[PDB]
């Protein structure tokens, strides 16, 4: 196994089209999430909706229909070939970013503008797992449209935007969703990796593995042979261990971070490196 | 250590100039055609050229902060993670669009209602990204720190196209260099995308490395051994060899095409992989 030889803000966040700002903690170290991006065994196995590149993450593309009161997209996989409602959520690189509008910038697969702006609520008709969304637009989308998430915006009138949230995918998932990832307690705490993203009425967005550490994984099919592989966060520049993390076979990341602080106290251009494979309960130095 | 290539079929690979998928390998129709992209650039020891970033996620992204003229808009650029942009041994910030001889139209969010912004770009006089900025105009009303990527492209003039062959004046700019094709009847194996060019005579984009495979050499950080190094592309399922390349030290592929054929006739599900070093005189099996 190896990880990623490259900086941490060379990196992409793997739920959002935008560059990795900043390593945190939650506010609520128990707090537990799951996400549908951004998630990958340490084998090499994707899960939930989760693509392979950076540039199919939070990504659309369908066949626009007529509805009941506007139009609405029969979804494809992002290639143009046919989605089936099977064992996904979702498309691969649907987005994940739950209980919120969005708000999603497509073209059709040209003269004057070739661009329209999909406005999208999760509300009944929100049926991705399906393969049917709903949207209303300001200009006139026909045909195959392709797009990408441009920005997400609250659900209701002054509510705020919580990206840390799923969407609920329809009332026909019962489907591999990706299990939720829960803290391993004993002082850890899930490392989370976040970007600048414009939320309106949040402005970060988190995810739990960078998409080059998706790919990396698909890409080596790499035996585990520990439970647990500790890694090193080095500066490039000093060669200097900057602090422990813990990758794990279900592909999320921990530490133990210092009271009052975490790794959002580290330099944001470290580069993770694998060191060793350790037993489940291997006590890490405390970070930040 | 050894050089590979990604483990990745190419249907799974971004487009290194435009934030896009692959989805088809082709020669141009002038085979002795030269190119000078910018992005997508990278030797195999791992070593980025011209303004070639790492990440998919920073490809085609523009970043700086708005002001203004005596007569307008323009944006002083910095790199995409906020750090200042200096005019040394680079083109422009790295991940800065190499899409030459047209109009850009960029969407961008305000790094802090409808928070995007429509940066429409001429490349004239003002434009200046080796110097460290630009001019736009906006229906919108962009402030402050402006983030964001390539949206669509259209002709500078009413009678013209986009050729999205051509790069941009950028001003002695530091330019990669040219890129020939080698001789011994190879022809450069060119990665499209489909993307919205508005005017031009097909919606696609050009590029010369996979976006992951400059990722993975600049990890990799492997030494050439020599002149060439032989890729077979093979069928993930059947694991037959579909068609011999060669990857130069330089950053490119070649292949030699059937006459009235190439890459283009050969399916898009295909993974490269690593098969020996070679002579710079090694002659290729035709392929397509
Ligand atoms: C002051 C007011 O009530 N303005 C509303 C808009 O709501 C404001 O802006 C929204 C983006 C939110 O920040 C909201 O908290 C704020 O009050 C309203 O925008 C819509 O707001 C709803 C939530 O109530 C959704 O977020 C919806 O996606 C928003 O519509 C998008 O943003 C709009 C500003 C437009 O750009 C639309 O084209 C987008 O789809 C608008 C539209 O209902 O009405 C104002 O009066
Ligand atoms: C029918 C007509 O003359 N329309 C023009 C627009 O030009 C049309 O749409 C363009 C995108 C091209 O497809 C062109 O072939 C077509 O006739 C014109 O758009 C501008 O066109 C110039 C080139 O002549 C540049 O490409 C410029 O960037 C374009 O402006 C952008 O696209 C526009 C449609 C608007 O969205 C602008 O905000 C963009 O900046 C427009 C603008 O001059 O005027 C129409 O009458």
Redesign the interface.
Same mark, same amino acid.
């Given at each position: 196994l190896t990880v !990623?030889?490259?900086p941490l &803000? &060379?990196?992409? &966040?793997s739920r959002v089209?935008? /560059?990795i &700002?900043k390593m945190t903690v939650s506010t609520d170290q128990n707090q537990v999430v799951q996400f549908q991006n951004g998630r990958c065994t340490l084998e090499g196995q994707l899960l939930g909706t989760t !693509? +392979? $590149?950076?540039?199919?993450?939070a990504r659309i593309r369908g066949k626009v229909f007529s509805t009941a009161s506007g139009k609405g997209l029969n979804l494809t996989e992002? #290639?143009g070939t046919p989605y089936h409602a099977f064992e996904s959520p979702a498309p691969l690189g649907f987005p994940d970013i739950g209980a919120c509008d969005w708000?999603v $910038?497509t073209?059709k697969?040209? $003269?004057? #503008?070739? /661009?329209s702006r999909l406005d999208v609520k999760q509300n009944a008709p929100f049926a991705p797992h399906l393969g049917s969304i709903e949207f209303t637009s300001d200009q006139d989308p026909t045909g195959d449209q392709?797009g990408?998430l441009?920005?997400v915006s609250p659900s209701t009138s002054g509510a705020r935007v919580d990206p840390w949230k799923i969407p609920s995918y329809g009332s026909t998932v019962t489907t591999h969703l990706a299990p939720p990832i829960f803290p391993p307690g004993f002082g850890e705490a899930i490392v989370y990796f976040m970007s #600048?993203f414009?939320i309106?009425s949040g402005?970060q967005v988190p995810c739990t593995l960078p998409?080059?550490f998706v790919?990396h994984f +698909?890409?080596?099919?790499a035996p585990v042979r520990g439970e647990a592989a500790l890694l090193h966060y080095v500066d490039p520049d000093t060669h200097r261990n900057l602090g422990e993390f813990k990758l794990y076979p279900d592909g999320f990341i921990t530490c133990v971070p210092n009271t009052g602080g975490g790794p959002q106290n580290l330099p944001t251009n470290g580069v993770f490196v694998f060191s060793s494979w350790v037993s489940r309960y291997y006590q890490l130095k405390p970070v930040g």
């Amino acid at each position: 196994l190896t990880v !990623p030889n490259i900086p941490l &803000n &060379n990196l992409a &966040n793997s739920r959002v089209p935008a /560059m990795i &700002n900043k390593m945190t903690v939650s506010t609520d170290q128990n707090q537990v999430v799951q996400f549908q991006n951004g998630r990958c065994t340490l084998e090499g196995q994707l899960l939930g909706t989760t !693509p +392979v $590149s950076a540039s199919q993450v939070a990504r659309i593309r369908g066949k626009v229909f007529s509805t009941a009161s506007g139009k609405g997209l029969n979804l494809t996989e992002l #290639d143009g070939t046919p989605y089936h409602a099977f064992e996904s959520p979702a498309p691969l690189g649907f987005p994940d970013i739950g209980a919120c509008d969005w708000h999603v $910038s497509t073209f059709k697969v040209l $003269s004057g #503008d070739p /661009m329209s702006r999909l406005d999208v609520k999760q509300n009944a008709p929100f049926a991705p797992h399906l393969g049917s969304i709903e949207f209303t637009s300001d200009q006139d989308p026909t045909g195959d449209q392709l797009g990408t998430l441009a920005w997400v915006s609250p659900s209701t009138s002054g509510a705020r935007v919580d990206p840390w949230k799923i969407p609920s995918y329809g009332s026909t998932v019962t489907t591999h969703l990706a299990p939720p990832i829960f803290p391993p307690g004993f002082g850890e705490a899930i490392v989370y990796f976040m970007s #600048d993203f414009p939320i309106v009425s949040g402005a970060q967005v988190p995810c739990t593995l960078p998409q080059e550490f998706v790919s990396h994984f +698909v890409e080596q099919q790499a035996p585990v042979r520990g439970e647990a592989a500790l890694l090193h966060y080095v500066d490039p520049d000093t060669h200097r261990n900057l602090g422990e993390f813990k990758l794990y076979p279900d592909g999320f990341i921990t530490c133990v971070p210092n009271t009052g602080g975490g790794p959002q106290n580290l330099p944001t251009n470290g580069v993770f490196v694998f060191s060793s494979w350790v037993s489940r309960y291997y006590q890490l130095k405390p970070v930040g």
